[PDB]
Amino acid sequence: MKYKIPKNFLSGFQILSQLDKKEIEELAKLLGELPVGSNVQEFQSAIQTNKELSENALKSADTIFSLGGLLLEIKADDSLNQVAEDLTNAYAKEGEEEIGTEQREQLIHNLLIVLQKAENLKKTFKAYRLLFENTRSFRKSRVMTDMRMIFDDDFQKKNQTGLIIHQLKLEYIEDNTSKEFFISLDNDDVLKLSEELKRSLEKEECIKRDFDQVQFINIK
Amino acid sequence: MKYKIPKNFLSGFQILSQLDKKEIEELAKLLGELPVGSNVQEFQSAIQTNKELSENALKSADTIFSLGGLLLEIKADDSLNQVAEDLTNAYAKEGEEEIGTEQREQLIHNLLIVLQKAENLKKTFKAYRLLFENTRSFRKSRVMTDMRMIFDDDFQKKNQTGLIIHQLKLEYIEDNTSKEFFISLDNDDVLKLSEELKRSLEKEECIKRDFDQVQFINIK
Amino acid sequence: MKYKIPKNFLSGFQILSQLDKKEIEELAKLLGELPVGSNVQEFQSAIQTNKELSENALKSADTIFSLGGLLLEIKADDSLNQVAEDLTNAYAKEGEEEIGTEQREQLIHNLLIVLQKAENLKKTFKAYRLLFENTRSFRKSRVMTDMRMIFDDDFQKKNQTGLIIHQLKLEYIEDNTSKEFFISLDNDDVLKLSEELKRSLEKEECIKRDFDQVQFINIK
Amino acid sequence: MKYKIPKNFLSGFQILSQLDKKEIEELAKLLGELPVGSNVQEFQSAIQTNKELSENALKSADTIFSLGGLLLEIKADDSLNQVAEDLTNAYAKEGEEEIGTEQREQLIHNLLIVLQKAENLKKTFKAYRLLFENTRSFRKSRVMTDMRMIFDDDFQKKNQTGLIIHQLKLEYIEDNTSKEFFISLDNDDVLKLSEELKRSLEKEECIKRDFDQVQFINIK
Amino acid sequence: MKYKIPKNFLSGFQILSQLDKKEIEELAKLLGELPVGSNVQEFQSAIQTNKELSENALKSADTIFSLGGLLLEIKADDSLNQVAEDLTNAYAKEGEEEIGTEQREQLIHNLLIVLQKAENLKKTFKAYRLLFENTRSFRKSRVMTDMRMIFDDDFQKKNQTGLIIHQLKLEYIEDNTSKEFFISLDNDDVLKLSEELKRSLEKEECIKRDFDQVQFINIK
Amino acid sequence: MKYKIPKNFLSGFQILSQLDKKEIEELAKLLGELPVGSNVQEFQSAIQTNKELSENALKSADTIFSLGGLLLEIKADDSLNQVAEDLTNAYAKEGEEEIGTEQREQLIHNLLIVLQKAENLKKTFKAYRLLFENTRSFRKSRVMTDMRMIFDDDFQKKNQTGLIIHQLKLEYIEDNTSKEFFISLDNDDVLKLSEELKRSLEKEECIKRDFDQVQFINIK
Amino acid sequence: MKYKIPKNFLSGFQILSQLDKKEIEELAKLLGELPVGSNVQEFQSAIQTNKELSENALKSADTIFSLGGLLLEIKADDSLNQVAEDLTNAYAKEGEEEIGTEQREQLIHNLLIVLQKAENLKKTFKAYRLLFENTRSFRKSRVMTDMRMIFDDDFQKKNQTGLIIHQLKLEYIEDNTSKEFFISLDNDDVLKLSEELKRSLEKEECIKRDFDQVQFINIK
Amino acid sequence: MKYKIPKNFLSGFQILSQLDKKEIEELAKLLGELPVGSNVQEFQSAIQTNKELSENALKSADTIFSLGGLLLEIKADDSLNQVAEDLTNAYAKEGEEEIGTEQREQLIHNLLIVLQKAENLKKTFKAYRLLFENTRSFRKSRVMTDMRMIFDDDFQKKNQTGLIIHQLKLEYIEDNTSKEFFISLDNDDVLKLSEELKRSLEKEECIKRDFDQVQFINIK
Amino acid sequence: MKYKIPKNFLSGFQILSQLDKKEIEELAKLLGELPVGSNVQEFQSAIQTNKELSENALKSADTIFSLGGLLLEIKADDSLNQVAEDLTNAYAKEGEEEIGTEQREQLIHNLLIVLQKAENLKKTFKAYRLLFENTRSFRKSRVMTDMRMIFDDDFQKKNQTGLIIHQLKLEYIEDNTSKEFFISLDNDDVLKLSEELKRSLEKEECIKRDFDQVQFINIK
């Protein structure tokens, strides 16, 4: 079929098919005003705080935000109108209802209205797509350090000496698989790494500064 | 045999067997004055700068420093005198010369003189031994970062946007085997890691401060 | 050929072939007086301290002691005379000399004289054979213990608490391959193990006591 | 959600949400009086023997003791108040009831009261956490020994001789997986190991003695 | 080339090329009188005891016996004359000498004389070939049995009871690879196996008896 | 719980709990008269042929015979009284009925009466336990032999010759897993193996004879 | 139990248990008249065409034919009467009905009547058993051939040349697993293989002819 | 370098460099008259039988025939003149002689003369190249068949029955690696395969017949 | 040592150590005039065509070009003077000569002169370094296509139909390992791929056009 439709989005598809023309047009306007990099939580909170929006939009907001992952899975080589028609067929086949012709056309028209524009969201999910062409990425880390004292073969001598060691442990996702990695350190190397990363941070700040003509974004 | 004698230390063993009584006693005194954690390079440089020492000591200094790795490979359960005798036999069997009885006894006596004392050096190599009961340890790392701009399907629109990414690569030894590991980062996580490691550094400083009654050393 | 002859035993075979009749007969007598479980070092030391024995016996003593490993590799189903003849052929083919007929017969006769009797030595090496039908056995072990103190998140509180841990490491041979194994313990389990092994030791002593009619040996 | 809530603790969560203010405050006091290293069985028995405590506390005692494993899974970087709120939400979502606002606030307040303090319990579970950063640990062992007699090829000779062997078998957990290991011994090595472990025990006693200023605990 | 010529048979090939016409004809006669199943040792001993045969035949007897393994490696589809010519070329190329034309023709003629006939030897090596189309075959075995007594937890009771066990170990060749296999038995199963193998032996004797019109051979 | 109670033994446990005092005492007497090595079938048949025994004993006879496998799974270090109490609790928790206090005490008392004594049965199952510390054991075997005739490339010659081969196939259990093994033989090796096993059988008979002071049993 | 009873044969077992004495005796006679190698389809068709036989026999004919696979799974070492009794017990335990004593005895008697004789069928399934002691066997094959023409780099030259190739593909069962194998051929090798297989066919015909005293069968 | 020059072709390259102009031109003519599919042996025999050709051509004939494998390893995209120059350089660098300029030019001119034309040979080696784009191909096979008789459990019955089986074994090269494959057959399947391959042979003959306008070749 | 010195560059190092001051200064000037992306062949050809340069420069030109791979293996964190000193030591230790002090200083000074500047070459090898942080890259490919005709089961019908197929094969290096990959295509997909790659080529041209302020290079 046209799309690998999740079975949970079917209610959102029904809401969008039955949604009012005013609501879809206003949502399209707001999406066209959406800045790049906005996340799902902020979008849904803004929808909630918008009084003119019924709960239908918020209940379908996740589906709307999910469009960015399929807005680029589709390509300019195809006609958005035919994409809307085929996806309406896919939803009527695998979704909640075999939509009647009038609501089928309403859903297709709403798809065309909303799937159009969608520029900043599509670019955001492209940045995310360009982001993870790689193999792996961090998620978190934890630092652990221990100290241990030095003893004698015969304890007729009191313990005067010890040793301090350091450990780091990190977490990351590789090829859609979560992972972690464990290492032990000494303070001097930690300081050296701090110097390296501080130098790279200054580089990054200078890069912020270099192209005042262009914007550079953090995407989460 | 008593020891897995390196074939390069044979000249050092010959020098020690023929070494003067004054030189061995003075070297034993200096070693008994050696602070814990002193490395081979510093010891050899100090030997060189000491005028009373002939080149024999410096040429055997590496062997002297190598004793710490076998000073603990031996154990208090054995008699140092018999250890010296057996190692003299091992050297006379696998080493340069089948030592004559007089020089055999001279070598054994010199071993007893110098292998005795050797407290701080033995404790240093114990710290190194207690150090690497683990599996792996760092050696170095390198930070790499890249930036990339965002484009349009049709370049009727000028490029206004881009994305900045960061990469770290690290090197380490595991189970006597050198290794490396590669990861990509974002600035926020780098800052968070900096905060973590700075907190741990403050912890380490407070640990420096906590036990004024005991010393804690960095060993290299 | 008859035996997988070591190339170092060839000198011992030559000595035995040329050895005096008095010496071989006396050695056969002494071997027939040998108690079970005697090791090579004790046998060679006794040979050295025996004045009537020339250095030929001591230089061939290791070969004599090596017979126990091949005294059972052979079996009663074969004639010791033909075994001696075939092994003389094997030595003359792979060994030092193509023995002349007179010394060939002398060697065969000496083999028959000495390979005969050899009761306690053969039984000792059978015990060793019955010993290692298994897979693995110990060789040594080492006990290691460490202690570590408990700290606070904020060191406004002084450290009042710590923890003590124990470690054991062991060495063993499996299937002719040396091995080791590492574990960490607590004092209570160490005490419990001490109780178990003490109970088993009392069992072993009672077993010493139970069969006064039979002897039980430790073989090394 | 906030926590990987076990589905059996839901009743304990309900009890805690509906629990009396006097009971939660008294339990918080008792927990603040709890010494480090106390185990679940002793805590529950003490709760049972305490007359002022209803069966609600004992039925939720296991959940209370389970907090130590999640008291450190959380970290000081987060606000305990928000932790309580989020975990109340998690319980109301995955647990028994969609708690009403009044009992929701009661549960959050009770969490704040009891999750606070909890110093010795948290330190105990930290010691357990610091305990098992390793790979494996014992659980038990069993000692087995056998004896076997020596025979002749022809039994015209009566059996006068035998051999005694010893076996040890041990059990341990590695990486959350139970394991065992099997070895055979001789009495001499058993005695040698006894000597080693006794020496280490004397070391441990001297370590007990060395730091009178600090306490060291056994945790089970 | 025609054959994977062993480099040790080259002397035998030279002897055969230079061998007398009378000797080759007599050897061909004797081989045509050879019964099936005769082994190399018996053939060589008979050659030695035959006075009319020079040492040339015995020194080439092993090569003659080796022909059976290549007498069937060749096939009736090829002309024995051309086989002799090609193998003479192979020997002159890889062997001792680039044979002169006269001795080349002599060798080819001798090959034709002797490689002809060779009926019983060829059939014997065919039986050996038909023998080892399988995967594996025995070579030897050894039987081992042990007995062990039953003890009490407290030896206030004297040992009245024991247990007897049996072991068998076997050796075999599989796919040109030597192998062994180990098992433990009880007396009853040994008796049952004895009964089975005795029944099969009676079957084999009846099979000896059944076809008086045909002969059946043991080949070694 | 105390025991991994089979769910089929629950009826036997109920019968034993409700069983008469006379019956349990008589069964304990009979078990104390039981010789070592008696199997379940013989015990149950004897119970059936005993007129004073009701069907309760036979229906619980299998459970009684199953005690030997758990009579040694328990150990002398534990109190049989507490073992009976804990197993009564285990049965009342996982078994047919939450036994009333009077029948609970009756069951515990019956367990103490019958679980006591049980000397020969416990020793029998110990022999079985000492039996299978190994890896594998036989269960059966089958002997197969075939004969095949020798033919010619051209059948102008009548077939005069053939070959006889032998095969053995065996079955065994390894590590609680059934197994089999297949081999082909020749008559001579079969005869040799017969000689070996007959020699070992004579050894076993001489071992029967050697210790008239002790008994040795076959256990099935 | 006695047999791994298929759950579909239970109806056949019921029919046989209730079958008339005349029918079972007549079927036993017919089976004793059955020639070796008869397949299930022919046997069932003959049963159908036999007017004296009710549909009971045909409905149980498959079970009757299935006996050959278990007629040899049993062995002469066991009593056919006890085999019938035990299999009647197995059917009454795992089959349709807990047979009443009268019909149980009827079934056992019918088994004894019919399981007896059964000579040619048993020998047929033995031939099938002797057949598949091997690893694999054919099931089918398919021949495929293709031809391709030769072209020029520049087609200013007309194509005058081509190449013809051949392919064979085959199917077989190995170790109860179906398999296939694919190869490409040339006409000359196909002709050579035809010659080989024709020669072997002539060999097989001569083998048909050689032993007029014995019969040789094709079994399917 | 230009070509992976074999070190044995160096003499052929020298001969070609020093070869006469008449000889190279005549050889080029003959090669231009060579039909497609001619093999090395036939070409060399024709060269030998040609009186006008010196032994130089035959000694370089193998190199000439080897050109087809490198005549297509080169491609029309390159200039044959520059190919000749570069290969002359390669031969002068890795070959016998650092050719003088005059003989260097002679060799290049001879290469251009002979490497030109070479149409049928190049097409032949292209057919061979187009041949082995696949993975594997036959080399030979062998057919083996056996027969075995059927016996009784008790030989009171004479053997009346037997079974005949068939075996095929084949050899092939895969990915430049020689291989073989073993299977057992029955006469019926052999006949069926004969029918299949005969049908395919008739297909191949009809394919011979179909395109009278084109030729199709067998290449060896 | 400082560098993993190739043993072939030793002559280049000697030449550079003995090289004239004028030559090294002129070469440094020329290198500072070198544009980015220049390859070794062009650099060496330019050196050859430069009359003022002796053959010393060309013979050391490859070493000079090899500096880019080690100019970045070193880093700005180190002093180029000390790098030159350490590499002079490395060459004097592992290279041709233990350089005399005067020529040692000359070599160090020449290294400082030439290793300095080197901007475009270093950036070129950085681009190559930034190039192959990936895993693999192409080297070549080859396109192959075939056509095949459609036939009938019975050739009473003439062949009117066929099928055309296409194949592509490609070569690439992965992780310093050469590789290839094989696929079959149809004309339509080839056309579609042509359209895709043409669109991407237009994109690349527009990218050429977009940043007139910056240069973008092809590096080989």
Author numbering:
A (entry chain D), B (entry chain C), C (entry chain E), D (entry chain F), E (entry chain G), F (entry chain H), ...: 1 to 220
Copy out sentences from the published article reporting this entry, exactly as the authors wrote them.
As an example, MBK5214510 shows evidence for the presence of dimeric, tetrameric, hexameric, octameric and decameric species. In parallel to the crystallographic studies, we also determined the structure of MBK5214510 by cryo-EM and single particle analysis (**[Fig fig4]; [Fig figs6]; [Table tbls2]**). Within the 2D classes there were clear examples of top views of both octameric and decameric ring structures. Filtering of these two different classes allowed us to resolve the octameric and decameric structures at ∼4.2 Å and ∼4.8 Å resolution respectively (**[Fig fig4]; [Fig figs6]**). The octameric particles resembled the octameric ring we observed in the crystal structure, while the decameric particles were assembled in the same way as the octameric rings, but were composed of five identical homodimers rather than four. The decamer determined by cryo-EM is more divergent from the predicted decamer, with a significantly larger central pore, and is also wider than the cryo-EM structure of the human COMMD1-10 heterodecameric complex (**[Fig figs7]-[Fig figs8]**). (**B)** and **(C)** Cryo-EM structures of MBK5214510 octamers and decamers. These different oligomeric species are present in the same purified sample, indicating a degree of structural plasticity in the stoichiometry of the ring-shaped assemblies. In both cases a star shaped structure is observed with C-terminal COMM domains forming a central platform and the HN domains lying peripherally on each side. AlphaFold2 predictions were able to produce confident models of closed ring structures using either 8 or 10 monomers (predictions using more or fewer subunits produce either fragments of rings (e.g A0A558G9V7) or physically unreasonable structures) (**[Fig figs1]-[Fig figs3]**). The modelling, biophysical data (**[Fig fig3]; Fig. S4**) and cryo-EM data (**[Fig fig4]**) thus supports the idea that the bacterial COMMD-like proteins have a capacity to form closed ring structures with some plasticity as to the number of dimeric building blocks that are incorporated.
The ten eukaryotic COMMD proteins are core components of the Commander complex, with central roles in endosomal membrane trafficking and signalling. We find that while CCDC22, CCDC93, DENND10, VPS26C and VPS35L are restricted to the eukaryotic lineage, ancestral COMMD proteins are present in both Bacteria and Archaea. These prokaryotic COMMD-like proteins have very low sequence identity (<20%) to any eukaryotic COMMD family members but share a conserved and highly similar fold including both HN and COMM domains. Our biophysical studies, crystal and cryo-EM structures confirm COMMD-like proteins readily form homooligomeric rings composed of eight or ten subunits assembled from core dimeric building blocks and inter-dimer interactions that are analogous to the heterodecameric core structure of the eukaryotic Commander complex.
